[PDB]
Design a protein around this nucleic acid. Structure first.
Lengths: 93, 94, 82, 109, 53, 51, 108, 93, 81, 95
DNA sequence: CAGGATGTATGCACGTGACCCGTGCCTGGAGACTAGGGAGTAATCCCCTTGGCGGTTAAAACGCGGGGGACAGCGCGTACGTGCGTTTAAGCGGTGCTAGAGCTGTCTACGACCAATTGAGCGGCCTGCAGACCGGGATTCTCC
DNA sequence: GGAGAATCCCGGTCTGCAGGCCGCTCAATTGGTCGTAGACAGCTCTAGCACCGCTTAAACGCACGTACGCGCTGTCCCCCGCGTTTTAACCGCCAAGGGGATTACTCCCTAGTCTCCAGGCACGGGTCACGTGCATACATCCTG
């Protein structure tokens, strides 16, 4: 029996963001559900965008558009920058 | 001359019975295109797209004015005021 | 260049909107307030309709892009598509 | 951007902490589309990690302000409701054991 | 506008009366007994023929 | 253009109908030589067929 | 079960197209597999709701001395019915207008 | 160049509900918007129900449950009865 | 089990109003509040039981509550999901 | 000595907005959930976590309602909340 | 009271837009068949929930005094409503030009799919630390 | 300015939970083939835009009066703070068993393929309903 969660990555990100600071299991559960919800929103909107067009594939364009739609104000700009940077580094060399 | 507020009731009935759009079309086209230009330049609009925007935005303002009325009545007034719009939007979450 | 067309939302137009909504007396400041509200609402719908248009690499905003923006905000609209 | 570090794991190859593999698996099994492009989970993992970093930064600030070393749900709620963009993103959300901001209106005082 | 509306509705009822007259004539002619959809020109021409017969 | 042609066909239809009414009026003795409405032509044709 | 003309709609007794509903369930990736009775059940539901609205819209049309359904009638049919108003309460209807209602405090 | 619509079935249902009443083209467009919205609601909710239970298959049980969840009051009970009858009749031969 | 809505005492309503920032509570608020709460609970629980019944379980799990609240536009973080 | 009417109300507001506790007693809330469940399916078992999730949701919901209700009272130029305020809040909110 | 000028009610002829019917054509749906996987069933185990018990305690209920607030009445002055004449821009019909949406046809680059190899990370365990809790005192807010 | 109660700071105590380590299974990664989705070039034609003149309704500016909104006052009732008593939640503990979780096995239904035909679509033709303007007949007011 097994169950998979994002808690290990939440912990790593916290260790980078505030290196001396811990996180209680309840906060971990909330962060885990936050990751689940945001994933579901972006994937749902990317699906809706793919299906609004006559397109079978979810690509980084569907996701960039979905992030511009879903996130408010500055948060969209920074998230779009992060996504673009990651795909750039990943496809580079 | 009629007692003040009488012609308002006549108007309420007239406009609630009718279905045509209340805001003039050419001004709303200019407004929509002016707002759109802030997001992207050189956009064309489908003739029916602006009609969808009138239908939705005008129906939204009708709905907001309805709630705006309730706030004034709760405050024991007849006259609606900016506080009523602000309360309605605050409770709605706009 | 289109500027200041929000003034085209006249006092009578706002008064008719309110009367249809059941309003009997309207304060002189409601016109100033309602224009602001309408501008906010239009910005939020048009931003998304443009975003759909731009995603699709189109230059013409369609009634379907508007309907999708409205469906997305939870203010679904019938008669312009589905 | 930053120079490539050689690695097997797609996260390490992308410069991310979040798991590109698990995000790809969830996109494929979740019926979101018939097909999922190779760059799609990389973009999505970067977005999820960025948002996670924002919340944890604000929450750690709130924890320090409360003079405590571990983030707890109260700090998450404080972090959300004091930031306008996060409060717009999470306006409908209820956070278990978060409480509310200390809202006392001036007309009461 | 009430006057215009009144003339229009009166003429509309006159059109309904004329339709009753057409349907009465149509139903009177056995060749058109099942042909309820018969157009005005056909009712007139076939009625003329039936009357002469 | 095609719209105006459809309007022309409809005009021609009504012209043929007025001719048909004129023929029918002349066919019923109760209206021969008389001035009558289309409703009267139809009603008298009806009651004349009955009679 | 008396009727048995061979279209799946006709076999079910429905006016709505079962084959079309089956395509639409297979598309959109609602799930990996779609049961044979799924589009039948769903077509029956869509037809029932369609008939309910058309019934009330015809009633509204007769109340206005009209022989034809117009958007105004659809709006009245929905907004004067609690179940449909809950189902379609978010829905703006093109050229639908609004209910004829005035608050009592505004009247003499 | 073709695109499909539900207009014909809307019109047949209309004629069976009221023996004589027509429908305008604008009202018909509204009815098509309605049918597509209801379909999307039920099909989407049925997706959730299958996914939550680790099932690959949307069955009558999922649609029935989606109807109970989506429709209010009497509409639920009658929609379920109608759907059950249609499936039973369809299955009888 | 009957009359358990009285388990929501006036102080509980008053404390919830205190978190709501309320200085004074009129005496009719308590009855109105209980009516509002009971409606909310009935809706949430009916949906949770619907998920339970579809899954052929006899046990309501927290996930059923979460999936009920999601449909109301009220996403809840903390109990899984 | 006696604190002036409203002073302790402000003290309570400070206290409870600083806290994060559940404000309804758990056991009678659990009995309420079970009473309501007897309408929908007789003889269910409830996970303990499901009761907690329900309670947290209800308390969060009611606190939100009381915030909106306080606005309704203050707009009416009144300190004291009344059923009119709750009903207006819900009607504007769309319940 | 009779006739003319005017207003009112009626019937007839015309143009515009919409609806209903019939024809030919193609895509889409059904029928027959197959292979494969998913879901149904039985048997089993363990976890969690249900129920009950005893004692302690905070928290609930109640009554009372009292103060502060909710409510109706009154008068003053303004801002708004209501009506007119002038000005403005909308709405309509018409003409012409062109951007882009929409479609077809060709081809390559991409992800699905598979088998084989491997490590990140999951589950359980041990260990120590930040948190909650209490007692004691001093500092700050509230009521006179 | 004073007496009193609420809140905070400080030190000391114990505990449950956080955090890190080990072995391990299962998901992630690698390498290649295959078929398809999508990118791209090219062409056709509709829908959008710009501009004009003309008729007309809707908005604008103005003057005038009073219903209403606001503030002030007086009144009476209702809710809070408090003290005393009563009630049930909470906590810790135990026991029983039902029902959630898991595996192993089998059968049935769904996905996919190929063939063929029927229902629905786009389009054109014919009929119909409706609104507008002209000619005719009928009723009211003025003159003597």
């Amino acid at each position: 029996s097994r169950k998979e969660s994002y808690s290990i990555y939440v912990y790593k990100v916290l260790k980078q963001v505030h290196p001396d600071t811990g996180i209680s299991s309840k906060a971990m559960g909330i962060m885990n559900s936050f990751v689940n919800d945001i994933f579901e929103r972006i994937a749902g909107e990317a699906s809706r965008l793919a299906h609004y067009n006559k397109r079978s594939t979810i690509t980084s364009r569907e996701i960039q558009t979905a992030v511009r739609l879903l996130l408010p104000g500055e948060l969209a700009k920074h998230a779009v920058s992060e996504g673009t940077k990651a795909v750039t580094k990943y496809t580079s060399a | 001359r009629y007692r003040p507020g009488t012609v308002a009731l006549r108007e309420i009935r007239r406009y609630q019975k009718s279905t045509e759009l209340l805001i003039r079309k050419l001004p709303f086209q200019r407004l929509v295109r002016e707002i759109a230009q802030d997001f992207k330049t050189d956009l064309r609009f489908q003739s029916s797209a602006v009609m969808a925007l009138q239908e939705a935005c005008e129906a939204y303002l009708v709905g907001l004015f309805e709630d705006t009325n309730l706030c004034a009545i709760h405050a024991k007034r007849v006259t609606i005021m900016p506080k009523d719009i602000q309360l309605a939007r605050r409770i709605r979450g706009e | 260049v289109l500027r200041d067309n929000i003034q085209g939302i006249t006092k009578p137009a706002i008064r008719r909107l309110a009367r249809r909504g059941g309003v009997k007396r309207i304060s002189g400041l409601i016109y100033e307030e309602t224009r602001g509200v309408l501008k906010v609402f239009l910005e939020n719908v048009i931003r998304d309709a443009v975003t759909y248009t731009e995603h699709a690499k189109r230059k013409t905003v369609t009634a379907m892009d508007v309907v999708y923006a409205l469906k997305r905000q939870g203010r679904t609209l019938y008669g312009f598509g589905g | 951007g930053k120079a490539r570090a050689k690695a097997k794991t797609r996260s390490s190859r992308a410069g991310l902490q979040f798991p590109v593999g698990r995000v790809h698996r969830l996109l494929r099994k979740g019926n979101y589309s018939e097909r999922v492009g190779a760059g799609a989970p990389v973009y999505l993992a970067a977005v999820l990690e960025y948002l996670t970093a924002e919340i944890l930064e604000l929450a750690g600030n709130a924890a320090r302000d409360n003079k405590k070393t571990r983030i707890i749900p109260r700090h998450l709620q404080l972090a959300i409701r004091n930031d306008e963009e996060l409060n717009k993103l999470l306006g409908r959300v209820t956070i278990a054991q978060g409480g509310v901001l200390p809202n006392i209106q001036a007309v009461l005082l | 506008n009430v006057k215009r509306r009144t003339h229009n509705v009166l003429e509309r009822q006159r059109r309904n009366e004329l339709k009753r007259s057409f349907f009465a004539l149509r139903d009177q002619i056995p060749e058109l007994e099942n042909n309820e959809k018969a157009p005005k020109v056909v009712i007139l021409k076939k009625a003329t023929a039936y009357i002469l017969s | 253009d095609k719209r105006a042609h459809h309007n022309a066909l409809e005009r021609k239809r009504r012209d043929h109908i007025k001719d048909s009414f004129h023929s029918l009026r002349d066919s019923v003795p109760s209206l021969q030589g008389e001035k009558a409405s289309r409703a009267q032509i139809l009603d008298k044709a009806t009651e004349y067929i009955q009679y």
